[model samples]
Each structure stands twice: as structure tokens, then as C-alpha cells.
Target: DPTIFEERHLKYISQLGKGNFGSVELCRYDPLGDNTGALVAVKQLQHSGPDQQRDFQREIQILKALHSDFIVKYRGVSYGPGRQSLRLVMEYLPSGCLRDFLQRHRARLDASRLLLYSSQICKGMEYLGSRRCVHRALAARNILVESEAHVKIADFGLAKLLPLDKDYYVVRQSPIFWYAPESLSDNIFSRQSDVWSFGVVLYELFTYCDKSCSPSAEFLRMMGSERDVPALSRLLELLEEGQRLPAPPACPAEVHELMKLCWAPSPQDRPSFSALGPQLDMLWSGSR
Candidate 1:
């Protein structure tokens, strides 16, 4: 159960990170007396209109209903005077987001390390899929690495709770590179669409520590002169043409094949995360 956190009892420790909608602050909560407990991340989103506030309440509702080890936990929401911001308190993951972790520790990652991380992501997506939660923006940037071998899915701001009658959903804005071909063409999203994004994540892991060490180096190199095009337009072209990324120089053929399966032309052809998780487990076990 989540309680309304009185803004007065919370102490801002530091800024963990910032994004377009909100900023996450590391905070100390002592609602009763002065008994300081563990630190938590406070995501504060400033609101000025009915639309923004509605979205904030919807996000809080979804977060409260969701409870999974693979998913980040929502502790509570904060409210007070003077500040016109809605605050969401959540569990603190110390290792930072997955993208920065991959960039900073690229040298330390190998096939074994990569497999462990990838497997954990599959597990998280598996859980999300079973719950009919569409993580519209599933990417390395949205993932949190708790440890070298442990990770959890976070950033539910872009997540959607699917209704039983709906098989697909549409969004005008999204991370284009992560959108499935079907999603781009028909403006539809499903568990299969998430599988497509997970494939891109696989490419991210495989290409993380290449000679260039830039995650998009290989994709950019393949795009050639087109790499200079604006990101949105370029991604639209790629998606419209059903262009799949070439495998990184170091990716194993077996893993690359699996990635291709994820990016299959038809949504029905894409395997669900439930099936993919065990496949990834086998791949991890065989990777040595």
C-alpha cells in the first residue's frame, strides 16, 4: 500500500538523474518522528495543466498495481504546498541506468557478462508481458542495473496497461529505433512489439565494447552517409523499409540469428518473452 508522503518530512539528498518529464532525487524519508530509514529515489514531475496531472495519476495507479522483483517498486507519492510538483517515491537502484553502465564498464564486459545481463532483461520482460504491461519505451536507457549480474526494469512513465479487449495500442511519439516494423507501419503495439525492442537491446549488449565502444557505432557505420540524417526521419525510413540492423563485428552467429527472429517481418512470427526466456537461458548456459 502506498501512502501520501508529506513533503515536509522528506529531505532531498542529491539528484540521481533528470529527464524531460521529471527529475529523480535521492531522498531521505522520515514521516514519523526522526527515524531515518533507507534512502529512496523521488521522481518529481512538475504539473501545470489537467492533462499532465491526469497522466501523473494514471502512472501512479499502474505503479501501485504492479509488484514484481523484475519491476521497480513504487513506495509512495508525495504531496504538499508551495511546490506544484507530483512526486513518486521508488526503490533506489545504486548501479545507475543500464546505458551508462554499459558505456562506463564496457571493458569489463565479455560474453558471459553480457549473457547474464541479457538473461535478466528477458526475465523482466517476461514478467511484464505476462501482466499485459506494454513498456512502450523498452531500451537500455530505461533499464536499471542493480549489479553486474542483476538488473530490473524501470521508467514506467511510458508504460501502458493493456485492456483485455485490446490487442494493440498506438502512440504518436516513441523511440523510433525501438519500434517494431509492424508498429511503425500500423501504429500498433503488443508483446511482440516489445520483443522487437528487446532484439535491439541484444544488439546494444553485443556492440557495447567494440573498438569504437560507441553503442551505435556499427549501426551508424552501416548507414553510411545516411547517418547524418535527422534521427526521427532516419528512423522512420528504416522502420518503413523494415530495415534490420547488421550484426556487430563481435556478435556470435547464434545470437544474431535469435535477434533476427525477434525482428521478424510479422508480429505472429516473433516469439513471446516466455518462450524467449528459456531460449536465452539455454544460450547463456552454452555461452561459457
Candidate 2:
């Protein structure tokens, strides 16, 4: 019955979250050292049939090897070779996901908190980008927050080592709304793609947190309205013409401009994450 974890080091607690292909549960493992206990998130792969096995392996191997303060680390793994299913033991967060927190707290977080937290994400992404890494997916849901404002980018299932060749193409599958516009158009992605996604993330952070601001409705309105239609249509037209589209994050003018710089239609035109870092810090510091 306890064979799932099957150890004195691991104990099942409760369900923390779920996705299309997996579910996360709280797991505790104490080596009889501390007075309290240490808890981790054990992500069990739900059998999504035979097709999903490769992607799961991608996530497992990548997470298992990589180590960074900004990215989540693999704590342990389920048995393999003869195993039918696999599980990953990972760092758990008490505050849940950034998206959920934003929605629950709304105005309670205040201006300082929003900018500071967003800047924190910028630093984390900058670190990953420095290591020639790509988050590929940068959304509020993928960014996990812990105590003392410690944030780590989680869900490496979509993560990849950067700089794919001309012959390569990432298999298209991602959460719908969180995707960049280029992804929506099936364009080839780069670090710039991550920037585009980041802008939308900021937009969602501002609007999705509160019922008073309906970001989705605004997008729908833009879909029909002439003003937004032209800009949106032009962006699509550029991509169709093999030109990179302009980035427009829904933040202050300066912040939006910086985000757009990262989304330069051409991946080459996008600034490095390191370059964007200081700019974000300055913006928060009132130097911008």
C-alpha cells in the first residue's frame, strides 16, 4: 500500500497542485535531525498514455542535473528501469503559486510588493539566461514563491538548453493564454520569445489579480475594436512576412519599452537578460 513512495525518508501529505499531465503532493522527509520536519513537493506523473513518456523524461533528466538559485532543483526520484510510473521530488512552497497569490491577495500586496516581486523574477530569469538556458515558459503559474520572498522558477518540463539549430523545432504544446504571440503563430522561438511571454505575464499580473480588471475581456475587446485590431493584426502580419513583431508589455512606459526591447521581432534584436536586469532594478529604484 505504501509502495508508491515506499520509504522512511518520504511520506505523502496532501495534494498541492495539478496540471494536464501530473499532480503535485506534499512530501515530508526528515533524517531525524531537525526538531520540526522538511517538506517537499512530490510530483507524480499521471499516466497520460504512452505518448507523454518522452516529455516526462525530458523534464526529469533536465531538472535532476541542473542546479541554480533561480531554478527549482530535483530532490529525489522514483525507481526506474522496471518502474511503470515515475515521480520527482522537488522543493515545496508554502505560499503556493504566484498567480494564485496575486489573485487571492489582490490589493493587499501593494505597489512596492508588485514591483519588487516582478523585479525578483527578472533577476531569476537573468540568471538562467546567463547560463545559456531558456525557460521557454515564463508565467505566473510556473514561478513559485516561498517564505521571505524567495522565488524559484519551477516546471522545467518546458525548459530547454538554448540555441536550437535550423532543423530543430519544439513540439508545439503549451498553456494557451500564457503563450507569446509568436507561439500563437507557430513562429520559431528564441530567448526573445521568453521576453514576449514575460510581458504578457506582467499584463496578467496587473489585471488577473483583481475582478475589477478583466485582462481577458480587454483582449477580447481588442480583438474586435479597430484600434487594437490594427496593432494586433500588424503584429500577426509581420510574423507572416517573416519579420519579428513588436513587444508591448502592459506596464509603465519605461518598463513596457524595456520589455519591447527584449521582444525585438528578430531574436537577435532582443536584448540579453543581463541587460534587462539593471533596467528593471533602476525602474524600481526610481532611477528610470
Candidate 3:
């Protein structure tokens, strides 16, 4: 059951993050009608626009349906009169998103740690695939790290449930650099298309997320053309010419091969997360 929350139930502790559309904070929810309760992350929208309400509601709707240890857990929502104070409640991962986490621990990051994080991501996506839930935007910045060994997938605003018969979602295109060739050209999104995004994320992880290696920097650096159709046209052309992102810094052959497998322009050629997890786990075996 979705727990209905009142403003009285929430006790704000600290700000979790600041957003353009909203603010996130670590808060305690007193479901028992007591002063103390479970700690949760509260993502709240400050505006009362109708479009914002629907957008926030969409994310909450998608989140409440998922059940995965590797994914962020959705609690319940808190709404003030007629969507005035809309708050999306979710489990709070202490260490924050993977990109920032990697940056903080850049000095200590080893190959074994990389394998564990990547393996956990595969497990998360494997479960998402089983449920026919396609995470349209998969990136390191969208993944949350729980501990040294555990991580959870986050940011499900763009995710959608695919039809059983079609098994793909075709939508309008965007100039997001995370896109696979299929996603950029045809705008057809599938679980396989998501595999390509995983490769980009793998690079982000292995590269230690320096400004020079980030997707924003490496891919979009000084192309001179703004975010218009020309940039996308140039993108498809570059991809067609057998160009791809560089192997992450000091990336070993074993894991680099996995990234290579995911970058296949042909979606049919890419491997699924179910198959990818065990292979990823192998790299961390003796290191543990």
C-alpha cells in the first residue's frame, strides 16, 4: 500500500541535492504517528505548475512499480493541497551517485572495485529487463552507490514499460550523447539499445570521471556547432566512420572487451545484462 504522508510526518535533516526543478533532502518519515521514523530521501518540487505535477507524478508512478535490490527503493509520496507541495519519497543511498562517488574515491579505485560496481549494474538491469522496464537514460550519474560493495540504479523519470508484442519504444529523438547509433538515428529504444549506454557508463567509471574524460567534455568538446540537427548529423557520420569512444584510462583488456561488446552498432550483436553480469563478476573473483 502506498502510504499517504502529511507535512507533519516529515522532519527535514539535511539537503541531499539541489536541482533545477526541485530540491532533495534527507528526511525522517514518522509513519507510526510518532516523532521518529524511517529515514528517506525527499525530492520535492517547489513550483505548482500543472506540467511539473504530471512530470513528477510520472516518475513516482514508475518508481512505485519496481522492486529491485539493485534499484533505489520508492517509499511513498507527500502531496499538499492539489499538488502544491509534491514530494517523491525514496530510499537514500548514503554515498550518492556513482560518478561523484568514483571521483571521491578516485585515488583508491582499483580494478576489482570497478568490476563489482559494473556487475551490480548488470544485475539491476537484468531484473529490469525481466520486468520489461526499459531505463531510457542509463548513466553513471544516474546510478547511486550504497557502500563499498553495493549500488542501486536511480533516476527513472525517462523509463517506461515496453509492450510485450513490440518489445521496443520509438519516440522522438534527442541530441543526448549517451545514445547508441540506433537510438540516435531511428529513435527506436530497446533493451539492447540500453546496452550501448552501459558501455558509455563503463567508460565513465573506468576513467575516474575527470572533466577531460566526461561525456560532456570528451564527446561534446568544442564541436563548434550548437545543440542543433547538424551536431546529430555529424554524430551519426562519425559513428558510421568506425569511430567510438576511447578505452578508459589504464583499462585492462578483460573489461575493455566487455565495453567493446556493448558498443556494437548492431543491437542484435550486443549481449544482455543477464549474460554480462557473471562475466563482469569474474574479474573481481580473486581480488576479493
Candidate 4:
């Protein structure tokens, strides 16, 4: 049964960050009594409108059913008169999200650490695949690092839970930069599409860029029409073509090969997370 969070049970701590939905806050939850020692993240939605409520309920149902160390844990929901919006209580991860972590530490991180984080991600996705859940948004931004090299997949608002017979789901809204070519062209989403996004995340890890980093000045010079056209035009064209992102300057060839495998043009060719996880583990062990 879902535990109901009353106003008195929670003590707001501080603001964490703001997103398209609303703001997230750090909070102390005392389900039994005051300061009973439960710290959590309280995601406060902007409105409790019908549409928002339905979406929240769906997300809650999925979260409540999922049990994995690699996935963020959902606590409960809070609704009351003092605050008109809904508050979702989730396990509080003290360390910041994976995107910022990579941005800050990429230069100094060892190959072993990178492989470890990547392996953890594969484990999380494997769990989702086992449940036939497709996480539409699988990027560094949607991943949260709990401790050193320990991470969990987050941001399931765009995830789809489908029956075994149905292999794909269509979404009205998709993140263009992170989406696979099939998803961009047909709005079709599947485990294979998630594999493609995972490739993008691997590229991000290698290049230390939020998106694929290219030789901008040279690319613009080659284009010969930068002044006449928009700067993003070429970028969009590359994405549409599904051109393989360049490997990092000093990255190992084997790692880059795995990334290319994930970016295979045919969804049938992409390796499943169950297969990828063991590969990552091997790479991590070999690196040590």
C-alpha cells in the first residue's frame, strides 16, 4: 500500500533544482514521529491539474512496482490543502546528477572508474528491459550518481511500459539531440532506441560534452555556407544521418567499437543491455 504523506510528516529542507515540471526540494520525512530519520527528495509539481494527476499516478504505479538498486526508489505522494500542488517523495541521493559529475571530473577520471559507471548504467537498463519498460530518455542528465561510481537511472516521466507482444511505443514529444534516428523519423520507441541513446551517453562520457563534440571550426569551414545558414543546420543533418560520433582523443579502440555497435543503423543489430553489462564488466576488469 502507498503511504500517504501528511503535512506534519515532512519538514522542507532546501531547494535542489528546477525542471520543466517543477522544483525539487530536500526534505526530512518523519513517518512515525518528528525527526524519525528519513531524508528524501520532494518533487513539487507546479499544478495538480487532471492531466498532471493522471501522469503522476501512472509514474507512481510504475515506480512502486520496480525494485532495483540501479533505479531511484520512490517513497510516496503528498496532497493537501496548504499546498495546491502534488509532492512526490523519493530517496534522496546526496551526490549530484551524472551530467554535472562527468563535466566536473571527466579530465581526471580513470578508465576503470568510467567503465564502472558505464557498467552500472547497463545493469539499470537491463533491469528495465527485463520488465519490458522502455526509458525514452536515457542520458547522463537522467542518471544520478549516488556515491563514487555508484549510479541509478532517474527521470521516468518519459518511460513507457508495454506488453510483451508490443515491441514499440510512440511518443508525441521527444528530445531531438538524444533520440535515435528511428525515434526522430517515426516517433517509434523500443529497447533498441534506448540502446542508441546509451551510445550517445557513451559518447558524452568520452568527449566530456553534453552532446557529441566535433571539430566546429573545421566543420564550419568545410560547410562553406556558415554565414548564409544557421549554425545548427549541420548538426541536425549529422543527427538525421546518424553519423557516428567521434571517439575521444585517447580513448581505447575497443570502447569506441562498443559505442558503434550501439549506434548500428538497424535496431535488430544493437546489443541488448543484458549482453552489454557483461561486456562492460569485462572491460572494467581488464582495465584494472
Best by lDDT: 3
For model 4, residues 1-288, the per-residue Cα lDDT tens digits are 456777667888898776566677998987776577588888776745666557666777777678898999988888777544567788898887888887787678777787888888898899999888998888887789899769898887767787768988876645555677778777888999999899877766666553335335434544555566754565556655765567776457887988889988888899989888888899988888
> Candidates 2 and 4: which is better by TM-score?
4
My TM-score estimates for the predictions, one after another, are: 0.87, 0.77, 0.86, 0.85
Residue-by-residue lDDT tens digits, candidate 3, 1-288: 466667678889998776556677999887686766988898887644777667678778878888888999988888776555778888888888998988888999897888788888988999989988789879888899888788899877567778989878887633267888988888899999888898888888889877788766765753546656466787788777767778886577777898888988789899998878888888777568
Can you write out model 2's per-residue Cα lDDT over 1-288, one digit (the tens) per residue? Answer: 222343455677899877777788897865573535678888766757665666677677777766767677677776544344577778788888888888877767654465666677777777766555567778887788775355677877666665544422354556544455566666555566777677656665555354444444444443434554544454465444544322233356776576556556655676766777777777667732
Query: Who is ahead in lDDT, 2 or 3?
Result: 3
Question: lDDT values of the candidates?
Answer: 0.78, 0.64, 0.81, 0.77
Lowest-sum lDDT 10-residue window in model 1 = 209-218
Superposed by TM-score, candidate 4 places the C-alpha of residue 79 at a distance from the truth, in angstroms, of: 2.3
Using TM-score as the measure, the top candidate is: 1
lDDT, candidate 1, at 199: 91
Candidate 1 lDDT by residue in tens digits, 199-248 = 98888888773446443554466465855687656665765576777877
Query: Native-vs-model 3 lDDT?
Result: 0.81
What stretches of model 3 exceed 4 Å from their correct place? Answer: 12-23, 30-37, 46-55, 173-175, 220-230
